Amino acid sequence: SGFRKMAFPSGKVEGCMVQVTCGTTTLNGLWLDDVVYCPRHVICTSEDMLNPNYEDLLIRKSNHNFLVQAGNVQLRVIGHSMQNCVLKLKVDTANPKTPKYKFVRIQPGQTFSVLACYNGSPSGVYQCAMRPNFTIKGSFLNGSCGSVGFNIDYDCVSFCYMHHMELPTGVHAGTDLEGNFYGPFVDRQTAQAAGTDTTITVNVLAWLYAAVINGDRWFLNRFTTTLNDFNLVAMKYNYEPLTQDHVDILGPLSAQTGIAVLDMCASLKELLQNGMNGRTILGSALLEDEFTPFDVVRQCS
Amino acid sequence: SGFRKMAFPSGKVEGCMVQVTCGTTTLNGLWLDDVVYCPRHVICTSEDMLNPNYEDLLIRKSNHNFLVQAGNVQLRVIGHSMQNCVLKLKVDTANPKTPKYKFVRIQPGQTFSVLACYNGSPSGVYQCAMRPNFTIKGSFLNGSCGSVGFNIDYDCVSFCYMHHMELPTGVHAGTDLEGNFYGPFVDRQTAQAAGTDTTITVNVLAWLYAAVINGDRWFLNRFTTTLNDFNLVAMKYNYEPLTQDHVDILGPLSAQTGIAVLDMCASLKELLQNGMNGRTILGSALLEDEFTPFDVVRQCS
Ligand SMILES: OCc1cnc(N2CCOCC2)s1
Ligand SMILES: [Cl-]
Ligand SMILES: [Cl-]
């Protein structure tokens, strides 16, 4: 039946994307009810970016300093404030395409869909995990800033990410929709590096369950193991520790397949020590860690 | 930077998806203007699966046998005709969400986005390529039939795929939106199997050019090759023959990076001989063949 990195359908979010301009800087905003959300760094000249005083730069600004474009319509900005690293532009018009939504903050290891934008114009959608080091491995060029991450639960869009910057290594850093950074990052032109990342162990196991469900069974074995024995291997390979809670979340997949988590940890232990003996799993030569147990259950059942 | 299997924003396709029911069979239809397109096999029962006489099964149907449903709204069917393997249900309402669109037949190697859908509700979006053996490696469960593949260039949706069936090896077969199958396949449950699959050589080369644009150079070598020597090597690894057409298509990525097409071909021959020696290219430990030369520029420069 097959297994693919799958994004949520993006239409409910496409209806919310606008172009925000302040001086020379144009980038993407999120228009929900009568507010446009975008990165506060939209107000900064290149010179400001080196050591910005947002407080001071913003009082110096007025409503008319902000051009908001929803397709071929100018919105009138009637107010401006800041919450953490996010700029809120109050507009005269409630977005008639506002979906059922909430602002949510996600945990490392959780996945979400990204609508990549360019002049308030949506261009692509991809799935990605919040890394243990609080970065994401996006695909962004200039103009992507204010591109947004989301999940959909029934009809409700849960917004969890707004893109702020690229780090030197090609990875991306951003905020929740309340403007709190994911990770130890600041919105200033300064020296910042991604911390050393780790592998999301519970997601690798979920993806091994997806492989078995799809008839990729070769890596299975008669053996089992313990959390403690496994976690001494994981810690060795820069794998996150597996907790009792991770084992409980993989419950449904363990039932559906007949392979218990420490059963499957034994398989993963051997893959870490011995490698893949030149094979693939679901058409990958890497151990994939950007599918959650929920993602595997949603896609396979 | 970053390099991601990115799907087109799905919103313009989401507003076209409906549920078609006939007898005890429910699947997806595509509602454009006053027509719903779906697989003709919606009109089959149990003993119509091996040798359906579609002309005989359809003449016995009236408009009211077809229950079409857009969210909660029932659409009234006022007409029906068959075009190749696609059924066309005429309805009394034109879809107010109809985007600018066209129907295109794609060739092997081309990529598109798939909007996977169940009971006319979109569930996810992913990027595919038409394999050289005219199948797609999708993610499709029971009820996905009538899910569509598409590109979006400058606000115009080009429909290129409609999902009909899963073959014994877990890969997928379907039609263009004129009802003609890709490959030698038929909408009958008689034994059928895909041709042996090959790697899309032109796409792999485009992806090596993207790796060089994004700063990877470790796999380059001082060698060149003749086109003919390259094909004699590449076919021993089940790679598609590279043609002069393919060489012309890579010209711009050649010019951008200053590496001739037959120099990059020498690099590919070396990678097939050596593998990757614990390294990765753009985040993969395999040579990726689902990015086209056109996609590589859409996502790079
Ligand atoms: O219940 C019997 C079936 C199971 N899976 C099916 N699908 C898989 C691929 O998409 C079309 C057919 S029919
Ligand atoms: Cl400050
Ligand atoms: Cl094509």
- What amino acid positions of B are annotated as catalytic residues? 41, 145
Structural contact between residues A270 and A221, judged by C-beta atoms closer than 8 angstroms: yes
Contact (CB, 8 A) for A2 and A214 = yes
- Give Cα separations from B43 to B47, B55, B59 (angstroms): 12, 11, 11
CA–CA separation, A27 vs A121, rounded Å? 10
- Strands of B77-83's sheet, edge to edge? B73-75, B66-70, B17-22, B25-32, B35-39, B86-91, B77-83
Q: If phi over 0 gives left and psi between -120 and 50 gives alpha, with beta otherwise, what is residue B23?
A: left
Q: Which of B7, B15, B137 sits opposite A124 (nearest CB)?
A: B7
Tokens in use for A141?
Answer: 């060029």
The number of beta carbons lying within 10 Å of the beta carbon of residue B158 is 18
CA distance A249 to A297: 11
Total residue length of chain B = 301
Per residue in B234-249, is it b (16+ CB within 10 Å) or e — as a string?
Answer: beeeebbebeeebbeb
Q: Minimum-distance ligand to the CA of A51?
A: 2
Tokens of A138: 């996006």
Experimental method used, please?
A: X-ray
Contact B61, B80 (CB under 8 A): yes
Phi-psi category of B183—alpha, beta or left, where left has phi over 0 and alpha has psi -120 to 50? Answer: left
Contacts of A42 (CB under 8 A, 6+ apart): A20, A22, A25, A27, A87, A145, A146
The count of other CB atoms within 10 Å of the CB of residue A20 is 28
What is the rounded CA–CA span in Å between residue A146 and residue A164? 6
Instruction: Please tell me the distance from the alpha carbon of residue B268 to that of residue A233, in angstroms, as a whole number.
Output: 35
DSSP code, position A258: S
User: Which among A2, A292, A299 has a CA at the least distance from the CA of B118?
Assistant: A299
Nearest CA in chain B to A275: B278
The number of C-alpha atoms within 13 Å of A146 and in the hemisphere containing its C-beta is 30
Which atom from ligand 1 is nearest to the alpha carbon of B138?
Answer: 9
Nearest 10 degrees: CA dihedral of B85, B70, A297, A147?
100
Q: Give the residue range(s) of CATH 2.40.10.10 domains in chain B.
A: 1-14+100-197, 15-99
Q: Whose CA is nearest to atom 1 of ligand 1?
A: B142
Tell me the pairing of strands B17-22 and A172-175: unpaired
Give the CA dihedral B225, B228, B233, B234, nearest 10 degrees. 100
Which chain B residues are Cβ-neighbours of A172 within 8 angstroms?
Answer: 2
In single-letter form, the type of residue at position A284 comes to S
* Ranges for all domains in chain B classified under CATH 1.10.1840.10: 198-301
Asked if the Cβ–Cβ distance from B15 to A11 is below 8 Å, we say yes
Would you give the end-to-end CA distance of chain A in angstroms?
A: 11
Q: Which residues make up the environment of ion ligand 2, defined by Cβ < 5 Å?
A: A 53-54
Task: Let me know: does B108 contact B16? Beta carbons within 8 Å.
Answer: no
Residues contacting A41, CB < 8 A, separation 6+: A25, A49, A52, A85, A145, A164, A187
Q: Is the Cβ pair B125, A8 closer than 8 Å?
A: yes
Which whole-number Å values give the CA distances from A197 to A132, A169, A208, in the listed order? 6, 12, 21
Task: Report which residue type is found at A82.
Answer: M
The class level of CATH for B15-99 reads: mainly beta
Using CA atoms, how far residue A216 sits from A99, B172, B287, in Å, is 40, 18, 20
CB-count burial class (<10 Å; 0-12, 13-18, 19+) for B154: exposed
Distance from CA of A12 to the nearest CA of B (A): 7
* Residues whose CB is less than 8 angstroms from the CB of residue A175 and which lie 6 or more positions away in sequence, other chains included: A39, A84, A85, A86, A161, A162, A164, A181, A182
User: Ligand 1 pocket: which residues have CB below 6 Å?
Assistant: A 1; B 140-142, 144-145, 165-166
Where do breaks (C to N over 2.5 Å) occur in chain B, by preceding residue number? none
Q: Which mutation among B38, B42, B145 tests ligand 1's pocket best, with the greatest number of atoms within 8 A of CB?
A: B145
**Closest in B15, B166, B284 to A1, CB measured:** B166
Q: Is residue B149 within 8 Å of residue B135, measured between CB atoms?
A: no
Q: What residues of A act catalytically? A: 41, 145
* Number of CB atoms found within 10 A of residue B88's CB: 16
How many Cα atoms within 13 Å fall on the side-chain side of residue B93?
A: 13
List Cα–Cα distances, A96 to A34, B4, B35, B298, in angstroms: 10, 32, 28, 31
Query: How many alpha carbons lie under 13 Å from residue A228 in its C-beta half-sphere?
Result: 0
> Measured between beta carbons, which residues in chain B are less than 8 angstroms from residue A126?
4-7
User: Distance (Å, rounded) from C-alpha A160 to C-alpha A291?
Assistant: 17
Asked if B3 lies within 8 A of A139 by C-beta distance, the reply is yes
Put simply, the answer to whether B123 touches A9 (Cβ < 8 Å) is: yes
As a whole number of angstroms, the distance between CA B287 and CA A156 comes to: 38
Protein residue whose Cα sits closest to atom 6 of ligand 1: B142
Placement of tokens 């110096």 in the chain: A60
Kindly list the distances between the CA atom of residue B28 and the CA atoms of B42, B157, B158, B269, in Å, as whole numbers in the listed order.
10, 18, 18, 44
Whether B10 and A299 lie within 8 Å, measured CB to CB: no
CB count in 10 Å sphere of residue B223: 12
**Backbone torsion region of residue A300, taken as left when φ is above 0, otherwise alpha when ψ lies between -120 and 50, otherwise beta:** alpha
Domain A1-14+100-197 top-level CATH class: mainly beta
B261-to-B94, B235, B273 alpha-carbon distances in Å: 49, 18, 19
The Cβ of residue A223 has, within 10 Å, a number of other Cβ atoms equal to: 12
User: Quick check: A120 and A19 in contact, CB under 8 A?
Assistant: yes
Region of residue B134 (left: phi > 0; alpha: psi -120 to 50; beta: else): left
What 8-state DSSP symbol labels residue A242?
A: P
Q: Give yes or no for a contact between A91 and A31, defined as CB atoms under 8 angstroms apart.
A: yes
Of B6, B172, B283, the CB nearest to A125: B6
HSE-CB at A65 with a 13 A cutoff on CA atoms is: 17
Q: Cα–Cα distance between B16 and B170 in angstroms, integer? A: 27
Question: Burial code of A151-171, b = ≥16 C-beta within 10 A, e = fewer?
Answer: bbeeeebbbbbbbbbbeeebb
For A198-301, give the CATH class: mainly alpha
**What one-letter code names the amino acid at A208?**
L
CB spacing of B2 vs A123 below 8 angstroms: no
Task: Tell me the nearest-neighbour CA distance from A58 into chain B, angstroms.
Answer: 30
- Residue B286: CB atoms within 10 A of its CB come to 16
Residue of B nearest to A5 (CA): B126
Any A CB within 8 A of B223 CB: no
- The pair of structure tokens assigned to B57 is 């099964």
- HSE-CB at B300 with a 13 A cutoff on CA atoms is 24
How many whole angstroms separate alpha carbon B229 and alpha carbon A92?
Answer: 66
Phi, psi of B160, rounded to the nearest 5 degrees: -125, -10
Reported resolution, Å: 2.0
Please state the three-class secondary structure of chain B as a single string.
CCCCCCECCCHHHHCCEEEEEECCEEEEEEEECCEEEEEHHHHCCHHHCCCCCHHHHHHCCCHHHEEEEECCEEECEEEEEEECCEEEEEECCCCCCCCEEEECCCCCCCEEEEEEEECCEEEEEEEEECCCCCCECCCCCCCCCCCEEEEEECCEEEEEEEEEEECCCCCEEEECCCCCECCCCCCCCCCCCCCCCCECHHHHHHHHHHHHHCCCCCCCCCCCCCHHHHHHHHHHHCECCCCHHHHHHCHHHHHHHCCCHHHHHHHHHHHHHHCCCCCCECCECCCCCCCCHHHHHHHCC
